[PDB]
Design a protein around this ligand. Structure first.
Ligand SMILES: OC[C@H]1O[C@H](O[C@H]2[C@@H](O)[C@H](O)[C@@H](CO)O[C@@H]2O)[C@@H](O)[C@@H](O)[C@@H]1O
Ligand SMILES: OC[C@H]1O[C@H](O[C@H]2[C@@H](O)[C@H](O)[C@@H](CO)O[C@@H]2O)[C@@H](O)[C@@H](O)[C@@H]1O
Ligand SMILES: OC[C@H]1O[C@H](O[C@H]2[C@@H](O)[C@H](O)[C@@H](CO)O[C@@H]2O)[C@@H](O)[C@@H](O)[C@@H]1O
Length: 114
């Protein structure tokens, strides 16, 4: 069981690499664009096994999963993906940058997961 996480505004897929960088890219069929969620709050890259992660400065990255709540995420019915620790929401732009920001209701902060 793995899902893609697609930005509602740009259509680009959340994606990450073994270096820990998180970004969005047009869908390319690769496993780096699939994510698993064991049900402990984590969103884990299907290819690298690293956990989606972010800090209070709004940086998003992956790290090996370490049990901290920076690596826990809440999926809302409106498509927000909120960081448990910071309460900021996963966000991205047309150029492929991924970050978190306080929720502003706009579509860049909305994601389709499936
Ligand atoms: O050939 C490597 C890799 O390329 C494509 O994936 C891109 C991106 O989605 C991945 O996050 C990064 C990981 O470093 O690589 C590319 O930039 C896909 O074709 C993928 O299947 C392939 O393994
Ligand atoms: O001790 C700080 C922090 O360490 C670990 O969290 C790491 C990472 O997952 C976090 O995203 C960033 C946020 O700045 O900090 C570390 O690099 C965890 O042990 C965490 O619970 C702890 O607060
Ligand atoms: O007015 C532009 C844009 O501003 C607000 O969104 C911000 C951020 O959430 C987006 O990721 C980036 C993407 O370029 O833009 C802003 O920093 C929202 O109000 C959004 O509805 C609006 O288009």
């Amino acid at each position: 069981a793995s899902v893609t996480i697609r930005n509602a505004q740009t259509g680009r897929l959340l994606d990450s690499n073994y270096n820990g960088n998180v970004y969005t890219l047009p869908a390319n069929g690769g496993n780096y664009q699939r994510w698993t969620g064991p049900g402990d709050g984590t969103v884990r890259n299907a290819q690298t096994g690293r956990c989606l992660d972010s800090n209070y400065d709004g940086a998003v990255y992956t790290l090996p999963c370490n049990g901290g709540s920076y690596q826990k995420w809440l999926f809302y019915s409106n498509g927000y993906i909120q960081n448990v620790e910071t309460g900021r929401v996963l966000d991205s732009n047309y150029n492929g940058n991924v970050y978190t920001l306080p929720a502003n209701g706009g579509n860049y902060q909305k994601w389709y997961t499936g």
